[PDB]
Design a protein around this ligand. Structure first.
Ligand SMILES: [Cl-]
Ligand SMILES: [K+]
Ligand SMILES: [Mg+2]
Length: 771
């Protein structure tokens, strides 16, 4: 019985608090009170329509065939205005909806299945999912979170442990290159890949013939933001515009560098294209802690499309040929590592051999360092990695790419003076210690902009410096003051995230506790009643579990990430796909299959509930006669785990065979059969560090490489003379090597004049900030 009034008419949803910093005045005052640098704002000319065939003559046929729009919009208007960027912060105080909704259906299913099954780890799984729903929130944070994050970046760059250039730490570019030959081994781009000699639009071959139509340019994310000067547009809406701007920037830089006044011309070009150095401060979608919603929102520094394209032309042809890591090469690098197809078992073999031989082991992946020492596994992270970067760290990376990558077999460069100018003299100041845009505020960026094309490379170089210093200090244990003292020595902040003690014993336990029943145990299509012990390496988010069926370690997503993803799944996030009938149900099948694939299969309660949910949805589709095989075959794009499992289809339900297939190696592994690094093959990181400590490799031997190192020290007014010094090697003229040797000797002599010594990175920053 209820009242007529009533008759007439699980954790609660998180509602973010009202944000007092959601206005430019309140945000600017907050930054000023915290001594965070706000730049004097710069303006961008309004858009003007130009004919595509006049602006992009190489693409005339594409316009004629109606495959490319006949006009391009370029910032050449008579009036200039200050740009404004307003991100979407969801959920927020006024809107708590489907976006960022926890998976309450899964929570209810986990509860129903726990009541029917005696899984000993079931109560803890349910408690963890419930706790993640109650304490976390998937979404894009707030203005307060973004602003507090900027303060933390400034603190890392300038606070307790101010940043240090590699030169201040004590490394020349050549010494860093010698370390990188070991920690980031690279191959040269393919011989058929064009050298760095052209405007980007010249790398597009279009005639209409599908057999020959090709682009030699990097690939792009069509749906990603165009960045400045096209706020609110995607890369798909602005490709022709990005080509026009990237061609103009490189052309104007090249012409200015060899002009009668290189300083005036180069500074003018940099100031005219200032917006190419300013990133949109995009709030990253993550599973944030509810209590810290307004204290921390991670940011993506959204690079202008022309800058992204020019930087990617330098890095991508090298990196595409350099998937060299500890599982296939004798290097500490984890670049291109996948734990699938036997990857995790290769890591476990290396770890086990190190333990048996009483050897220390180090692995590097961008801002992640893994150390095995004293029967202990250490997972180390640079503290807010990107904030530690100086423009000189990126310049050292450019030096490494141009000397080890962009070089012909005879030692001649695979670039001309224009591209050496962009790469060495200008590019590092465009994305490091430059600026970002939030609302109408042009803010200083402390360190490198997170998300720029060189994010991984610059972070990897900073970790390389920390590791080289650890080797130099006699490998002090990560838990000691001697290890923590490397922060001040390098100017790079870091912290120990995990300490996995009694490693040898933990590995023995993982093998011995491997279940006899279920998936990868006796090979049935059921989770084990009692999962075995995981080796919680947190190796790029992965733990290792022993399989009795396959007699190898296989990866499982770290428990905490698995639980967070089960509690707050990412939505479809594609409005076009969402409007197609069956896309939502296909995405739900994908969500439950992918959570099982990455490690849910080994969690009996999670596996039971997720299997029921995907099977129930497949049965409904079968009864209804609705075919979603198309969406299920092309599942990767609709899953946060899509990049982890390429080449598999979800059209058939997950079975033990799926788990076997994703873990099957193409080849057997012998760690001793791994090739040595392409450069200095016989040398190890330890031998390189010893050589450096003794004062070796200060200067490269190659005259071409010496010109590139001198390029980092000479002021922009010397660019015309530097172009003349590089011209014989760049043109591969008869006797170029002797000519280069002579020109490098003459330039070294002229450098005795201190008035000619100024970093072009400082000159670039000054021109970018000019008002
Ligand atoms: Cl940031
Ligand atoms: K620092
Ligand atoms: Mg890490």
């Amino acid at each position: 019985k209820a009242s007529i009034l009533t008759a007439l008419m699980i954790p609660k949803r998180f509602r973010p608090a009202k944000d007092p910093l959601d206005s430019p005045q309140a945000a600017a005052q907050f930054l000023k009170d915290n001594k965070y640098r706000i730049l004097r704002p710069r303006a961008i000319p309004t858009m003007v329509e130009l004919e595509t065939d006049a602006a992009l003559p190489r693409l005339r046929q594409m316009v004629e065939d109606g495959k490319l729009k006949d006009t391009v919009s370029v910032p050449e208007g008579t009036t200039a205005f200050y740009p404004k960027y307003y991100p979407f912060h969801k959920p927020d105080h006024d809107e708590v909806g489907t976006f960022g909704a926890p998976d309450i259906t899964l929570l209810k299913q986990l509860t129903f299945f726990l009541l029917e099954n005696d899984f000993p780890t079931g109560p803890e799984t349910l408690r963890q999912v419930r706790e993640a729903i109650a304490t976390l929130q998937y979404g894009s944070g707030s203005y307060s979170g973004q602003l507090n994050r900027l303060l933390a970046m400034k603190g890392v760059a300038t606070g307790r442990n101010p940043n240090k250039t590699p030169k201040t730490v004590g490394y020349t570019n050549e010494q860093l290159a010698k370390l990188l030959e070991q920690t980031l081994p690279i191959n040269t781009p393919k011989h058929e890949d064009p050298d760095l000699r052209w405007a980007p639009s010249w790398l597009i071959n279009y005639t209409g013939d599908l057999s020959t139509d090709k682009s030699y340019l990097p690939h792009v994310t069509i749906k990603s933001s165009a960045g400045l000067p096209y706020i609110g547009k995607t890369k798909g809406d602005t490709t022709a515009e990005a080509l026009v701007l990237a061609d103009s920037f490189i052309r104007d830089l090249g012409r200015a560098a060899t002009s009668a006044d290189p300083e005036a011309g180069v500074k003018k070009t940099i100031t005219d294209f200032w917006y190419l150095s300013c990133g949109l401060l995009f709030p990253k979608g993550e599973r944030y802690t509810q209590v810290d919603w307004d204290k921390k929102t991670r940011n993506i520094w959204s690079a202008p499309y022309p800058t992204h394209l020019l930087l990617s032309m330098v890095s991508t042809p090298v990196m595409n040929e350099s998937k060299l890591n500890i599982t296939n090469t004798q290097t500490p690098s984890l670049y291109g590592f996948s734990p699938f197809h036997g990857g995790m078992d290769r890591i476990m073999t290396i770890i086990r051999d190190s333990l048996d031989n009483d050897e220390d082991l180090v692995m590097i992946y961008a801002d992640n360092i893994y150390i095995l020492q004293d029967n202990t596994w250490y997972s180390i992270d640079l503290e807010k990695g990107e904030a530690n970067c100086t423009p000189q760290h990126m310049q050292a990376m450019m030096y490494y790419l141009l000397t080890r990558g962009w070089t012909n077999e005879d030692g001649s460069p695979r670039y001309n003076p224009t591209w050496a100018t962009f790469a060495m003299n200008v590019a590092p100041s465009m994305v490091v210690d430059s600026s970002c845009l939030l609302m109408n505020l042009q803010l200083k960026t402390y360190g490198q902009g997170s998300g720029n094309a060189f994010t991984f490379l610059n972070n990897h170089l900073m970790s390389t410096i920390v590791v080289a210093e650890w080797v130099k200090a006699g490998k002090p244990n990560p838990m000691t003051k001697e290890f923590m003292d490397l922060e001040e020595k390098t100017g790079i902040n870091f912290k120990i995230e995990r300490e996995l003690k009694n490693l040898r014993e933990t590995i023995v336990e993982a093998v011995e506790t491997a279940p006899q029943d279920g998936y990868l145990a006796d090979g049935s299509d059921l989770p084990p009643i009692r999962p075995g012990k995981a080796v919680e390496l947190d190796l790029l988010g992965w733990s290792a579990i022993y399989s009795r069926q396959m007699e190898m370690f296989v990866p499982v997503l770290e428990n905490e990430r698995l639980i967070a993803s089960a509690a707050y799944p990412k939505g479809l996030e594609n409005k076009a796909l969402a409007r197609k009938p069956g896309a939502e149900i296909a995405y739900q099948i994908v969500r439950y299959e992918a959570i099982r694939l990455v490690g849910g299969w080994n969690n009996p309660l999670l596996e039971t509930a997720a299997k029921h949910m995907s099977l129930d949805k497949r049965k409904r589709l079968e009864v209804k006669g609705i075919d979603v095989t198309g969406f299920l075959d092309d599942w990767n794009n609709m899953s946060e785990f899509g990049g982890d499992l390429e080449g598999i289809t979800l059209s058939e339900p997950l079975t033990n065979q799926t788990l076997v297939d994703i873990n099957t190696p193409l080849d057997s592994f012998d760690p001793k059969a791994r090739p040595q690094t392409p450069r200095s093959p016989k040398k190890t990181l330890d031998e390189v560090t010893t050589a450096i400590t003794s004062g070796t490799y200060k200067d490269p031997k190659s005259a071409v490489w010496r010109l590139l190192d001198q390029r980092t020290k000479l002021r922009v007014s010397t660019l015309r003379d530097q172009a003349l010094a590089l011209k014989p090697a760049s043109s591969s003229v008869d006797n170029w090597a002797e000519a280069t040797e002579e020109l490098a000797q003459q330039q070294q002599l002229l450098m005795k004049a201190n008035n000619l010594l100024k970093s072009s990175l400082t000159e670039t920053r000054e021109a970018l900030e000019k008002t």
